[PDB]
Amino acid sequence: GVCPKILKKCRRDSDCPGACICRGNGYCG
């Protein structure tokens, strides 16, 4: 897997695609 280079908002890791996790700014990384 891999996390895409997008700026996607999130509440938690379940909102984030591929291997992305939710970061402290409220976006996937």
UniProtKB/Swiss-Prot annotation:
Q: Name one Pfam family in it.
A: Squash
Q: Which residue positions hold the site described Reactive bond?
A: 5-6
Question: Where does it localize?
Answer: Secreted
Q: Does the keyword Aminoacyl-tRNA synthetase apply?
A: no
What's in the GO CC field? extracellular region
What does the UniProt record tell us about how this protein is modified after translation? Three isoforms of MCoTI-II are detected, two with the parent molecular weight, corresponding to the unmodified and proposed isopeptide forms, and one with a molecular weight 18 Da lower, corresponding to a succinimide cross-linked form. This is a cyclic peptide.
Q: Which cysteines are joined by disulfide bonds?
A: 3-20, 10-22, 16-28
Instruction: Supply one GO BP term.
Output: defense response
What are the alphabetically sorted keywords of the record? Answer: Disulfide bond, Isopeptide bond, Knottin, Plant defense, Protease inhibitor, Secreted, Serine protease inhibitor
Any one Gene Ontology MF annotation carried by this entry is:
serine-type endopeptidase inhibitor activity
InterPro entries per the record?
Answer: Prot_inh_squash (IPR000737), Proteinase_amylase_inhib_sf (IPR011052)
**CDD domains with a match to the protein in the record:** PlantTI
**Record's comment describing the protein's domains:** The presence of a 'disulfide through disulfide knot' structurally defines this protein as a knottin.
The UniProt function text for this chain reads:
Inhibits trypsin; probably participates in a plant defense mechanism.
Tell me which family the UniProt entry assigns to this protein: Belongs to the protease inhibitor I7 (squash-type serine protease inhibitor) family.
UniProt name for this protein: Trypsin inhibitor 2
